[PDB]
Ligand SMILES: C[C@@H]1O[C@@H](S[C@@H]2O[C@H](CO)[C@H](O)[C@H](O)[C@H]2O)[C@@H](O)[C@H](O)[C@@H]1O
Ligand SMILES: C[C@@H]1O[C@@H](S[C@@H]2O[C@H](CO)[C@H](O)[C@H](O)[C@H]2O)[C@@H](O)[C@H](O)[C@@H]1O
Ligand SMILES: C[C@@H]1O[C@@H](S[C@@H]2O[C@H](CO)[C@H](O)[C@H](O)[C@H]2O)[C@@H](O)[C@H](O)[C@@H]1O
Ligand SMILES: OC[C@H]1O[C@@H](S)[C@H](O)[C@@H](O)[C@H]1O
Ligand SMILES: [Ca+2]
Ligand SMILES: [Ca+2]
Ligand SMILES: [Ca+2]
Ligand SMILES: [Ca+2]
């Protein structure tokens with residue numbers, strides 16, 4: 237398993253020690269508070285009221301937690317994933333990323349705390 | 358394992374099929390959007406800024422997900438619990454509840470989607 | 479989890495730390511060599527060529543590993559059980575026992591090494 | 600998880616759907632009755648009284664269940680493995696094999712039934 241934090245201000249994200257392999261079942265739980273610029277903070281689902289003006293992941297809200305597995309495209313994580321198997325082909329290290337518009341991370345603040353583990357399969 | 362929905366306006370809570378037994382380890386993941394009255398909605402951690410006005414659980418925010426286990430007090434859940442063991446002498450049926458003030462549930466809306474599993478031991 | 483040894487010559491068997499509760503999924507693995515009297519030894523499946531002359535479990539061979547759960551009848555274990563769920567209404571402490579004819583355990587020798595754990599469920 | 604049979608007379612063994620990856624924890628349970636030639640049969644630990652005449656696995660008895668992982672040498676399985684981690688530098692598909700002398704498999708009989716799964720990590 238892996239525990240750690242993802243900073244809202246880091247366009248490169250946080251690499252983990254979890255290597256996702258074909259067939260793996262994983263569980264992720266995410267918590268905490270972050271902002272993409274405003275004084276308000278949101279949880280790991282982000283801001284449901286904010287439009288997409290060029291986010292790295294178009295399938296989650298601005299301010300959400302997302303990931304990449306190897307050199308996949310972005311995959312939504314939000315509050316987490318329960319006994320989840322990847323939409324197929326994907327493989328590699330899990331990198332966690334805060335969803336914002338590239339070039340605009342400089343006004344971001346806060347972080348998410350994240351646990352990941354592999355399940356029975 | 359159990360999957361289901363906890364309505365924000367259900368004061369009595371959602372009774373699950375999980376009986377927490379001595380020594381059990383469990384994982385919970387919660388998602389969704391709900392409100393304790395305002396037009397804005399919050400995720401399962403609730404609203405960090407709203408003051409505690411006699412919530413059923415003093416150790417979680419207004420609009421957070423909490424639970425009881427048998428005769429326990431309320432216990433916080435938020436976005437979830439990762440490979441977690443309960444307080445000494447707590448056991449029995451898990452009921453999931455939206456954290457609000459008694460008698461003030463009638464203006465609530467939305468729901469949280471929740472999964473609960475037992476882990477290896 | 480429980481890890482230990484089940485002696486062939488112990489008619490009362492071995493009361494483990496594992497309390498089987500409704501819905502639990504368990505794994506048991508058993509290894510080793512034991513005898514119900516002869517100079518030869520058999521593994522946890524016992525002696526397939528030996529007749530049943532009043533065995534405590536009629537559904538496994540003389541010299542096999544079996545168990546009781548709470549106040550159940552004997553249940554075959556053999557080399558182990560993989561992600562196993564008990565029949566309805568069976569619950570309580572797991573006792574491991576060597577399968578022999580009652581009153582004939584005194585000439586027995588050897589033991590099985592046994593691991594029991596609760597699995598995800 | 601994989602469930603299947605391993606024929607005692609199959610010198611190439613039985614390839615499974617399990618790909619062992621670094622960090623994986625697995626469980627195996629094996630059952631059944633097989634022979635390397637005599638009319639008598641033995642369980643998955645094999646025959647403790649027979650000498651090694653050039654077995655594919657010198658670390659288990661003739662008639663025992665063994666395995667290979669990818670390009671590995673033979674590793675004992677016997678009655679099974681509980682929440683087991685492979686040696687470092689061992690990875691790839693699991694193949695199950697009956698322990699006999701190469702070229703002498705043709706007079707073998709019976710089989711072992713085997714379950715393999717990946718466990719929480
Ligand atoms: C100035 C500010 O502009 C936006 S918030 C804005 O969001 C983008 C993503 O869409 C980037 O993260 C920027 O860094 C953020 O500042 C308005 O919603 C806000 O009300 C305010 O006017
Ligand atoms: C009228 C309303 O009052 C509160 S919201 C209020 O919160 C309590 C819990 O503290 C109960 O759930 C009520 O049912 C809710 O209406 C203010 O924060 C809000 O701005 C508004 O004035
Ligand atoms: C003829 C037979 O010889 C052996 S059994 C023998 O074992 C080897 C492995 O050591 C091969 O599997 C052969 O296929 C087997 O036949 C004696 O132990 C037996 O009593 C009998 O004389
Ligand atoms: O049938 C069981 C019986 O088998 C014979 S050979 C043993 O000597 C006895 O002690 C008893 O275990
Ligand atoms: Ca920003
Ligand atoms: Ca309310
Ligand atoms: Ca005896
Ligand atoms: Ca042979």
Ligand SMILES: [Cl-]
Pocket residue numbers: none
């Ligand atoms: Cl806080």
